[PDB]
Design a protein around this ligand. Structure first.
Ligand SMILES: [Mg+2]
Length: 207
């Protein structure tokens, strides 16, 4: 693999500090961002009195065009207020939102490519383990859920379809992000929700 983390390690420990920056409400607290000892990174949103704390990690590694990206994710957080997301970010222009689920009761879970000009596709996601695959090459960006050899992508965004396509710029790269947001537009009010809520990631691989 060009980049991977299998999130192996003792229960309660931090994700690999050579690969991830833990967002510092997000906090760098092992109660909210921790390896579970069973090969998963856990991002946990928890209520501390009136206040919610949760977790987010950003990859220190950035990858460019021509690769396939896949993560295995379990959403134990499909509740009001919660907003789990797996995305490939860029500081400047563009974003690949591989998988988002919204706790606001209004927006369907979806995959979205942003050029600046965006394309979105609704996805179903429940609380079971699923894999989420993104191939991003010169010609476009396409996606699979629970890939098996020869499966067709559920969503294909040709580079040509978005005139302001940033992704073929020289040296353009993206960083993987996993986060479990609470409230905001996508999460809605967490009051009626069930906390603590967990987003689990078994692995991310890029090749
Ligand atoms: Mg693992």
């Amino acid at each position: 693999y060009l980049f991977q983390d299998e999130f192996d390690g003792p229960a309660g420990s931090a994700p690999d500090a050579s690969k991830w920056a833990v967002a510092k409400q997000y906090r760098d607290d092992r109660r909210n961002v921790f390896l579970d000892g069973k090969s998963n990174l856990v991002l946990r949103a928890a209520k501390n009195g009136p206040t919610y704390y949760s977790g987010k990690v950003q990859s220190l590694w950035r990858g460019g065009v021509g690769h396939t990206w896949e993560a295995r994710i379990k959403l134990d957080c499909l509740t009001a207020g919660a907003w789990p997301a797996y995305w490939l970010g860029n500081d400047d222009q563009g974003e690949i939102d591989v998988m988002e689920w919204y706790g606001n009761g209004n927006w369907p879970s979806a995959t979205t490519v942003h050029a600046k000009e965006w394309k979105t596709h609704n996805i179903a996601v429940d609380s079971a383990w699923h894999t989420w695959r993104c191939q991003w090459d010169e010609a476009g960006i396409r996606f699979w859920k629970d890939y098996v050899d020869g499966a067709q992508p559920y969503f294909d965004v040709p580079a040509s379809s978005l005139p302001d396509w940033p992704f073929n710029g020289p040296g353009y790269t993206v960083f993987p992000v996993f986060n479990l947001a609470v409230a905001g537009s996508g999460g809605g009010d967490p009051g009626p929700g069930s906390y603590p809520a967990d987003m689990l990631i078994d692995w991310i691989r890029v090749w």
